[PDB]
Amino acid sequence: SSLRLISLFTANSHLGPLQISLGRMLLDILKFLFIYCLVLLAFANGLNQLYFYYENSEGMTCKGIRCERQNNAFSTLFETLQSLFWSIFGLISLYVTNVKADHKFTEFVGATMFGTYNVISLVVLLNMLIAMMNNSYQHIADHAD
Amino acid sequence: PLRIVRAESELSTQEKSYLSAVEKGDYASVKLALEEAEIYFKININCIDPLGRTALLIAIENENLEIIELLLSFNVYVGDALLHAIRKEVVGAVELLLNHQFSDFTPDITPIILAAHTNNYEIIKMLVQKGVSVPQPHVDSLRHSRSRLNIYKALASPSLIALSSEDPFLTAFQLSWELQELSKVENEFKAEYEELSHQCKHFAKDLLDQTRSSRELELILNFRNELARLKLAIKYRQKEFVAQPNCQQLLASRWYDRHWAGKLITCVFIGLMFPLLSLCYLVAPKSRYGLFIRKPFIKFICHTASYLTFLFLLLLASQHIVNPDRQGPKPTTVEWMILPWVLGFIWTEIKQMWDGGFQDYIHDWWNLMDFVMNSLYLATISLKIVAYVKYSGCKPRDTWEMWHPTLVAEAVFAIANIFSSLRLISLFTANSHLGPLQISLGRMLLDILKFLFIYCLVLLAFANGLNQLYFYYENSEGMTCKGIRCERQNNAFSTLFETLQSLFWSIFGLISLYVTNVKADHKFTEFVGATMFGTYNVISLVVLLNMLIAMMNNSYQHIADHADIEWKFARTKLWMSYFEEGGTLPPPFNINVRLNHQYQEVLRNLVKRYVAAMIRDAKTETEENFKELKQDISSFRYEVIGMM
Amino acid sequence: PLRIVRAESELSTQEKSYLSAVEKGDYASVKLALEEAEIYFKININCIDPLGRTALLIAIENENLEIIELLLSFNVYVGDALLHAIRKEVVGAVELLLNHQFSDFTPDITPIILAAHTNNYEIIKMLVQKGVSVPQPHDVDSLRHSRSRLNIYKALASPSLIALSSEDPFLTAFQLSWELQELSKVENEFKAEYEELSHQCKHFAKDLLDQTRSSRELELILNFRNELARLKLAIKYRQKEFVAQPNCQQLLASRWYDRHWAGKLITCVFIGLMFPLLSLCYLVAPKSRYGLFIRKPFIKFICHTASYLTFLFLLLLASQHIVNPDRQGPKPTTVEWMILPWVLGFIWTEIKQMWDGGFQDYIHDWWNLMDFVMNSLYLATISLKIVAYVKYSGCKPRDTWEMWHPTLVAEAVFAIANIFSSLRLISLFTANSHLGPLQISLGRMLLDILKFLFIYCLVLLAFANGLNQLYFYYENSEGMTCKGIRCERQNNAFSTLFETLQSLFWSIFGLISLYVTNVKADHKFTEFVGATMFGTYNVISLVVLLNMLIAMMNNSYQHIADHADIEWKFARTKLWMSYFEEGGTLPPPFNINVRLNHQYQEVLRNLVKRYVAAMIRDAKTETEENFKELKQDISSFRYEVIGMM
Amino acid sequence: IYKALASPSLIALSSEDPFLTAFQLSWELQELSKVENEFKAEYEELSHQCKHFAKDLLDQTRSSRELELILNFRNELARLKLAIKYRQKEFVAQPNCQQLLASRWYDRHWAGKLITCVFIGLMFPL
Amino acid sequence: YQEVLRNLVKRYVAAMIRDAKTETEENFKELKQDISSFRYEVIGMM
Ligand SMILES: Cn1c(=O)n(CCCO)c(=O)c2c1nc(Oc1ccc(/N=N/c3ccccc3)c(OC(F)(F)F)c1)n2Cc1ccc(Cl)cc1
Ligand SMILES: Cn1c(=O)n(CCCO)c(=O)c2c1nc(Oc1ccc(/N=N/c3ccccc3)c(OC(F)(F)F)c1)n2Cc1ccc(Cl)cc1
Ligand SMILES: Cn1c(=O)n(CCCO)c(=O)c2c1nc(Oc1ccc(/N=N/c3ccccc3)c(OC(F)(F)F)c1)n2Cc1ccc(Cl)cc1
């Protein structure tokens, strides 16, 4: 209800043209969301497959990533898909890659998967979203009045 | 389909030869055609063309004064042929026609208006000599709109201004002012009006470009105290006129009246002993330094060192050398030194207030910032005075009640120190490298302020839906803290104020993920709240903050285009604020008969040079080598006639 | 400065007027001046004006033939006037001069080479009719050896010369453009001119193909020398412009396809649902009803895609808790038995593709090395599983297993393996008109990212060296059950090189806390130094280094996106042509010329004739078309006046 | 055929109502640029030239009396609504018809407009 | 409406021909015209 008040911006000489050009650099973002979703699915399918054999629920008041002491980040597909999403904003801690065992080899592989996902999605994928958005505003503002 | 002809007819079978004779340059045939048609031979010497051109019209397209004279020798209808000749740039046809329902011109067009539209010195002069007038610009909306744009277009032509204006400089200053005002009230015709305003601004610069001496330039800028016409050129916002190389070179000679580490040391040394120069100017301004402080560059340096000393005193107020925690304390030794600076700033602002009469005083950012800072300082002084006579005594600061006057005074003083240190930005326009950067950094700041209208709406929309869901779960049992600003963040969405606070700190990632939890087993409302938080996070940084920089890039391109005239305008405005007398003491202290003839001669010479340059700028610029080719064949034809 | 004219001379007092008369076009004056036959009053007919122009060369500059013939009748010295006439493109001067130390032309320049340079059809044909030969392109004064080689390649790569002296202009343009591209890599000083010469050769083939009038001609050009033989030959030579032509793209799409937004996706899904029906029908009976239906390339593409999405489904279903506890050395489950046919089919396809090319141009592409890594990882997984099954048995708690256990490594490698399997599916974006150009221009700007890694890694190593050298003497391991930065209380960030190298990587994303720079001692000076170096690394990598990685990507996106439709069309046709043949119509789960020359040359002759006609008779206008109109009028006037009297 | 049927000279010479053929042909030349995707960059430009022709034709009005007759041909503003349906953004965003529309819409300074708008909006129930 | 449309089309045609014929390209015509006039005068005298 409160997000429909923006449609009234097309009545001011200043906020009018800006809103029209904003809604035209939005079909470009939709096209770029078919790659991030595939990358997210590909990395979740690996992280969950690696970490699904270490699911524990002993002596914990809560269970999930939305907790004071995060745990079971990659235990299930539902939690893996939404723990990777929250890592774009830096709200997932590093210790969630550990397990209750001395298996140092698997923890390193999981941390490497997490870091590889972080690199691709944040410095390789979100930087070329700006590159094509800036190079499409030029072709949009030519016919904007 | 079967294509046909609609609403048209055929011309003739005999008039085709007559119309082709004037087209192919023949003269004997056209002589015979009109001579034989004397006794009503039904040839209709006023024919028509597929393009709509009569016999007289074609003779003007291909300029042939002999055919035109032969035609006007007989009784032929002229109609709007004078307008056609004026628009077709034929001086001979215009001269011939001057002394002798379907139209392609609007009813409001007069020959003088169209000639001024064409911008030709000879035709405009010829029309003016015979005596013409233009209506004064002040039911039908379409006709009244395209009748004042035509008048203003004809009134802003450089040729007409140079021809029939008593003072072409003033009528170019005022014309650009009226045309720029009219663009605001005339939203449909806004591009047309703003282009004419720019044209009148370049005319003044081009007319000033024809000064061949330093005595002619010192006579134009000093007309009607010192630099009187230069100050008037700024009131009308003539950026091109001010930012002229000769004007800047003349102004730099009054500003100043070497390597970087031969001048930085000199500036530091000069600014080291500003109190000595101030004392010398205050006790005896005869020889030693009573005029040294009067130099604009020395005065600028001394005024900067005084402000830098003031900022250093505000840094020493927080040192623990300069008090216990007692209610209503006496001012420290540092604040006693701070007081004169504040009093001087207040006095300067007061003495500057009445000059503008509260009109255009609050027009720039810096004057409003000064007002806010001065008001905050006055509030600090008032609160410190109040707290001394009523809320006295000594008490531990942990036991004080919030809203205590001694606390509000310190808070208001702390806020005022931020504004006084940010005022140092305005000194960046005096540098060649930091100058243009600051101008481009303040003109795209207004660009940002338009994207902050949508962020407020999005923030309000999401805070409406988060609080509405999370308000019923508020609890404060066993909690010494209540809010997000503590180690265990809680009640993040329990009230509208804290919902607005916690939705702003999430832009920088300072809000943890467990604040979306409740002390219950309701795992469906928790997921919904987390989804709202995530959706707000998505379209605030990935989407909304990405198009903020996408348009910043493409608005910096236009700003940086003309970025050297704006910086020079700002620097000249900063410079001339130190030329005059009054305010030469730092804030720590201080607590026309034989005049018009020369100008008229200079103006006559300048206009003559301008017209001499403008005739060559058009008659020569692959068009100059077109009249020689016609002259060669004309001479050949004349020679052949002479021999034959 | 009292300046003077250095290193010059003066011409004469008499021949200046003769040169002026020659310039003005006065026939009588220059005729009587030259009448000093064998008795001259010290006037040289070979005088040189101060700008180097000669009387014979002056008439060439105005292409006025009367004084040209008059001078030629008196045996004036020519020397190189033919080259000047060729360069200025005057047909009459070349006609007259063809039958009769300082030079402004490079010594190895021959008239044919310069004529081919000017790209004038008439002069080249005129010279060829007499019989000439350009040296073949196939070291002591290397400056003029490279210049001479460049000149003959510029003459060879001219549309006019190719159109009248080539057996097959469609073939001499493919090879010559290929060798021009690879010759720009061995001569790096002239790489900007060799590569711009090859680009004009690719446009020539496209322009020659643009002159087809009917579909009968087009299908005969591309089928020369089983099907679409010449079209595949152009793909081998990387002729993107030739391939991405609308007229041939239409035919290729007609072969590919052999409705609205909601009317196409639904039927695509409907076709893809019964993937294993008309795949077993193919094996049972290849009849027109069902066996030949999958033969359509569009249907075959959908079958291979739905069969791959099915593989990605039960790949996602192998991590479910429903489908062999935590037992040591287990047998494969029921999902892995279904997984095995897909892996076997992929391995068989890679094996049959391996020897088909001999690892030349087969592993050079990025979409084959990833596949090889994927099958290698799958093979390692199955080998580790079968090794662990025969030497390990007994149910044991998982927490008690020692690391490097074969089962653990097997599942880790399997988890790594299927990440690449899902990421390979991004290669199908090139078949869609919306995600096609976006994906093609996505992996092309990615190559510019690889160059910032070479400086990022150097900065990382430089700072890691200093951080380790400072902090390696303070490490401790008592009272710490958990050790490292992947812990609730990070304690040993900069203790070893391996830990320092990865604690600086995690600081890009802000996952390293500020208390990891503290030591268990009252040494404030070293702690401050370590914090300062950590902050300096943060500033350089996040405020400077990564800020200017995006500052060029948009400035390089402009060049990439300029011709972004030709590359996408080339990729799409490369994808299409892999489904046009027989051999791949079996998804991996179910796989475990006497007259021809006559017609071709008779079509090509007409094509070349149309091209040359449109190139000469339709390019004089491209203002210059009306310049000769005034000359025609003046010539008619002159002829009428002269003949009347 | 389409490139010849879109020429302004032929429309201005052999059309009963050129304001309608520039609307109808510009619409069917825009949706035709999708079925023939191979030749689409030239069909789109062909449709674009049929949109500027209408704007140029409507730019020849001399008085406001004839302008109100063009926009009201065939209730009120019957042809302005028809142009919006055909997505003729150039025919609609013309200064003369903008100025006419603004007079119907409205039927002051920065601080003299907001203070009046808020007063009007604060007394809307009555 | 038909009368107004006729006026509009006539004005548009006039503007189109004026803009197309005039737009350097017009400078060619005044050369051909004077050449033809001189030629016709020469033939008339002879
Ligand atoms: C993806 N990732 C990752 O997930 N974690 C988490 C591990 C779990 O704790 C890292 O710690 C890490 C990392 N990436 C790097 O740094 C580079 C830098 C450049 C590279 N390549 N540059 C180029 C340049 C040009 C051409 C080709 C490659 C590169 O790739 C590489 F070297 F192959 F691994 C890795 N680190 C830090 C690190 C590095 C080395 C070591 Cl021995 C230990 C930690
Ligand atoms: C907004 N958000 C969110 O608040 N949380 C927090 C929930 C509680 O913490 C998420 O966890 C989350 C999320 N977004 C995604 O991932 C996508 C990405 C793109 C999508 N669609 N893209 C397009 C692009 C173009 C056209 C159409 C769609 C999409 O589909 C969806 F849901 F419809 F947005 C979901 N996740 C992670 C996640 C995903 C799936 C599942 Cl089952 C669980 C978690
Ligand atoms: C790199 N770094 C850092 O690692 N830590 C961590 C130390 C332990 O936690 C800081 O705290 C820090 C810092 N940088 C600054 O602030 C600047 C910023 C720009 C400067 N100059 N910019 C330019 C730009 C162009 C040309 C010349 C100079 C500059 O001047 C200086 F010192 F020279 F860098 C200082 N601070 C905060 C700080 C400031 C002052 C003080 Cl006394 C203490 C802390």
Side-chain angles (χ1 to χ4, degrees), chain C residues 49-338:
Chain C
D49 90 3
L51 301 113
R53 274 173 12 243
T54 314
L56 176 50
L57 279 88
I58 278 190
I60 302 198
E61 213 176 62
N62 326 123
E63 61 216 40
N64 164 343
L65 275 78
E66 320 289 346
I67 309 109
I68 281 282
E69 184 44 52
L70 199 142
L71 289 162
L72 264 286
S73 38
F74 282 72
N75 268 57
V76 289
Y77 174 79
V78 275
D80 69 273
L82 169 65
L83 281 79
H84 272 100
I86 287 191
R87 186 240 276 141
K88 196 223 206 333
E89 278 158 85
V90 175
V91 192
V94 173
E95 270 265 332
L96 293 168
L97 290 149
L98 257 183
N99 34 41
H100 169 75
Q101 174 47 248
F102 167 63
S103 177
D104 40 331
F105 280 119
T106 278
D108 50 72
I109 280 195
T110 57
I112 175 66
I113 288 193
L114 173 75
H117 287 184
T118 77
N119 217 310
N120 198 260
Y121 186 81
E122 267 304 331
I123 303 202
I124 297 175
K125 177 162 141 19
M126 200 126 52
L127 293 165
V128 169
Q129 287 206 238
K130 289 268 172 151
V132 317
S133 67
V134 55
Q136 64 114 38
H138 148 267
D139 256 318
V140 181
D141 193 297
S142 99
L143 184 144
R144 86 193 276 195
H145 176 265
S146 53
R147 167 102 260 138
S148 167
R149 208 223 290 107
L150 179 51
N151 274 354
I152 74 197
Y153 267 122
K154 191 167 337 191
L156 274 192
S158 87
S160 319
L161 185 49
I162 303 192
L164 60 104
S165 71
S166 324
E167 244 185 23
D168 183 0
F170 267 135
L171 202 69
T172 81
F174 289 170
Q175 323 213 275
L176 169 82
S177 98
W178 169 261
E179 69 182 332
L180 272 176
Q181 185 78 8
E182 93 199 348
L183 187 56
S184 90
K185 273 161 205 156
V186 317
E187 279 280 320
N188 32 62
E189 313 102 3
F190 304 85
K191 103 184 301 293
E193 334 203 14
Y194 276 115
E195 82 182 11
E196 95 160 318
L197 219 46
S198 174
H199 180 75
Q200 102 166 24
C201 277
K202 305 199 225 241
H203 277 268
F204 170 65
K206 152 181 157 245
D207 289 9
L208 192 42
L209 195 81
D210 272 8
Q211 310 294 331
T212 43
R213 300 285 187 68
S214 84
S215 173
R216 226 291 307 287
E217 293 176 350
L218 187 84
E219 58 62 10
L220 184 70
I221 298 277
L222 311 162
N223 267 328
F224 191 60
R225 278 232 294 286
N226 214 301
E227 217 78 340
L228 311 166
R230 197 176 267 289
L231 173 82
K232 308 206 217 79
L233 187 120
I235 294 188
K236 177 168 116 88
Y237 280 105
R238 310 221 275 257
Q239 303 273 316
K240 308 206 163 123
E241 263 93 355
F242 174 91
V243 171
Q245 214 253 330
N247 272 287
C248 95
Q249 224 57 47
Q250 211 197 339
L251 174 137
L252 261 204
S254 147
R255 301 262 317 236
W256 171 256
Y257 290 124
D258 217 289
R259 284 82 77 164
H260 55 79
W261 156 72
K264 183 79 143 224
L265 168 134
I266 187 162
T267 173
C268 284
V269 168
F270 176 72
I271 273 296
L273 284 193
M274 41 213 159
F275 137 74
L277 172 128
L278 42 78
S279 200
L280 180 95
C281 286
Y282 189 84
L283 295 130
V284 163
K287 196 54 181 182
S288 308
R289 29 159 280 287
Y290 259 120
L292 256 71
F293 185 62
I294 200 181
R295 294 312 305 241
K296 301 190 170 191
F298 199 16
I299 298 317
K300 186 189 312 186
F301 171 71
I302 297 193
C303 286
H304 279 241
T305 293
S307 147
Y308 195 84
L309 270 175
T310 283
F311 179 47
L312 265 39
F313 180 79
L314 85 181
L315 209 54
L316 247 174
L317 229 58
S319 76
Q320 222 82 353
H321 291 261
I322 314 300
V323 165
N324 43 19
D326 316 348
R327 67 223 317 194
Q328 144 180 333
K331 80 198 165 61
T333 58
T334 190
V335 175
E336 322 213 89
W337 282 126
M338 294 150 103

Side-chain angles (χ1 to χ4, degrees), chain C residues 11 45 53 65 122 125 127 138 176 206 296 301 309 360 364 367 370 386 398 412 460 540 563 595 640:
Chain C
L11 166 154
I45 43 171
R53 274 173 12 243
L65 275 78
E122 267 304 331
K125 177 162 141 19
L127 293 165
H138 148 267
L176 169 82
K206 152 181 157 245
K296 301 190 170 191
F301 171 71
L309 270 175
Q360 59 179 356
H364 289 67
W367 280 131
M370 150 171 318
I386 62 182
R398 188 181 267 277
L460 171 57
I540 283 183
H563 49 21
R595 188 47 190 254
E640 247 63 28

Side-chain angles (χ1 to χ4, degrees), chain C residues 514 527-537 539:
Chain C
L514 248 197
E527 285 168 3
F528 185 81
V529 172
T532 312
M533 317 189 323
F534 186 59
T536 305
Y537 168 75
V539 164

